[PDB]
């Protein structure tokens, strides 16, 4: 059937109740719009795991550290929906912030996931991950999905939502979707557009440096701090200004431990206007 | 026959079956040691859905006093036998280690900042965060159509309504009037904390609250003087009053010219028990 596009909470609730009463398995893909092929893979994955796929498009002011970053987030609903219909989404939910947070941001009920919200990317962005856990919890309550897809691309977010779901008793399968890459190896990102032509040809070096490290760990290498000193310099060498790098436990994002079962390598490096980032999971 | 479930996976199996059967579900959250007040919630819930789930869980996250948690009464077998006669369909009685497997330090929480820090939340810092967290988790686990709560915990009820409105829960929140002993004392699991002697003094809280309400019915509106007198009377009979309030019944803010109903919110220690009570007062004349 034709994809539905719903902007209001009452119309949403009507449709969600209908699907729930019919016993349809619901998948949810949360987004903030401005969609590219990475996001389409999320929708393709969701479609294989449920009867109906709900895609949200909502630029979430509770997760913006600077209120002005909202004013400059691209709004491209028509083009987002062209892509989503072609990938078989059943419903696009695109609400106004006034309808989602009618009582304002400061006194809005929130969900906080301790420790995971305030380390790493959370350290520099007070309140960011509270905004993420809050909206996602709200979307879970509104749409009542059996399955929800998130990109491995924003790995801390994925880990954050997995913990919230485990702690808060949500019966929802959280699916982490592998990053979509150019034939280069470069991970697809909205922000790849602000690189120059010459910079776009250096960009692949982030993934390649990252994967050299993964293969050492597969062979047994464990001296973590030195692996990372290496990579900050391999990268300096070839034209990046590295942000700090990490190798952490895949579940908690804490430093690795004799008991860690899976690691994540977390890369972040500057090239002109864009901060590029990549990551890779290593089995232990 | 009433079911009893302890484990989260078994609970989810049963909630799925009921939904497959097209059942509407009501939820009544409790911390056990059930009394006639709890039974009235259950009876109300049974009028509102096909099946009623009653939860029994002494929630450590809502106890800001370690002495209170340690001594809170646990009477699970007695609780289940009363619920069987009031036709509860399922009692969910989980272990803390299952609800909070890694303990509380790193447990994801839900906070309702509109209501969690004022009034009873000021007197009990940390408490309401525990309430919203466990209630949110129960809502996610059970996905009820209806949930019933006691007017006894008046601010708790408004806090849960606010959480539901803000977080997109498709759950009808129903309030149930307070049930009292024959002598007027509001029933409560913490009444067991009273000595035999103190139990005979305890009804004075309601008496004093109702004396205040009668003065308001006669037109008195000097709120701080009314509350000072009630505190003096509580002291006189052997209570130690906590902070007392009189607020707009709908918003819980201070009364204004627009207010049509007030709520008197009482709290007072008697021996080891911190008793609370409340009363709505119709301001219209
Ligand atoms: N290249 C990619 N591959 C897979 N998922 C992605 C990719 N880029 C973004 N996502 C996911 O899309 C969602 C919204 O991300 P963003 O585009 O950064 O707002 C998140 O779940 C991301 O992790
Ligand atoms: N005396 C009472 N009358 C009506 N409801 C009550 C009474 N005492 C407790 N409740 C309600 O029973 C539920 C569980 O209370 P508690 O077990 O004290 O956590 C809450 O919704 C309370 O507000
Ligand atoms: Cl309590």
UniProtKB/Swiss-Prot annotation, chain A:
Keyword ATP-binding recorded: yes
Lineage of the organism: Bacteria, Pseudomonadati, Pseudomonadota, Gammaproteobacteria, Enterobacterales
Keyword set, alphabetical order: ATP-binding, Cytoplasm, Ligase, Nucleotide-binding, Pantothenate biosynthesis
EC number(s) on file: 6.3.2.1
Protein name per UniProt: Pantothenate synthetase
Catalytic reaction(s) noted: (R)-pantoate + beta-alanine + ATP = (R)-pantothenate + AMP + diphosphate + H(+)
UniProt-annotated binding residues for beta-alanine: 63
Known pathway: Cofactor biosynthesis; (R)-pantothenate biosynthesis; (R)-pantothenate from (R)-pantoate and beta-alanine: step 1/1
Gene that specifies this protein: panC
Subcellular location, principal: cytoplasm
Residue numbers binding (R)-pantoate: 63, 157
Oligomer and partners: Homodimer.
Subcellular location field: Cytoplasm
Native source species: Yersinia pestis
Enzyme class (EC, first level): ligase
Function: Catalyzes the condensation of pantoate with beta-alanine in an ATP-dependent reaction via a pantoyl-adenylate intermediate.
Signal peptide: none
Alphabetized CDD domains for the sequence: PanC
Gene3D superfamilies for the chain: HUPs (3.40.50.620), Pantoate-beta-alanine ligase, C-terminal domain (3.30.1300.10)
């Amino acid at each position: 059937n034709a994809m539905l596009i719903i902007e209001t909470l009452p119309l949403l609730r009507q449709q969600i109740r209908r699907w729930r009463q019919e016993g349809k398995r619901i998948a949810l893909v949360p987004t903030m719009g401005n969609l590219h092929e990475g996001h389409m893979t999320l929708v393709d994955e969701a479609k294989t795991r449920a009867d109906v796929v709900v895609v949200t498009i909502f630029v979430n002011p509770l997760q913006f550290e600077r209120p002005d970053d909202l004013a400059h987030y691209p709004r491209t609903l028509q083009e987002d929906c062209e892509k989503l219909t072609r990938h078989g989404a059943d419903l696009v939910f695109a609400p106004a912030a006034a309808d989602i947070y009618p009582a304002g941001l400061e006194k809005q009920t929130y969900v906080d996931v301790p420790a995971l919200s305030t380390i790493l990317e959370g350290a520099s962005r007070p309140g960011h991950f509270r905004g993420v856990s809050t909206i996602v919890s709200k979307l879970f309550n509104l749409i009542q999905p059996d399955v929800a897809c998130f990109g491995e691309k924003d790995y801390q977010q994925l880990a954050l939502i997995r913990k919230m779901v485990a702690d808060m008793g949500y019966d929802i399968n959280i699916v982490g979707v592998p990053t979509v890459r150019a034939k280069d190896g470069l991970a697809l990102s909205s922000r790849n557009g602000y690189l120059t032509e010459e910079e776009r040809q250096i960009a692949p070096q982030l993934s390649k440096i990252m994967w050299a490290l993964a293969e050492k760990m597969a062979l047994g290498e464990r001296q973590i701090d030195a692996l990372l000193e290496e990579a900050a310099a391999q990268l300096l060498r070839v034209g990046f200004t590295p942000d700090e790098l990490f190798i952490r436990d895949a579940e908690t994002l804490q430093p690795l431990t004799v008991d860690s079962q899976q690691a994540v390598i977390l890369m972040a490096a500057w090239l002109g206007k864009a901060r590029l980032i990549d990551n890779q999971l290593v089995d232990l």
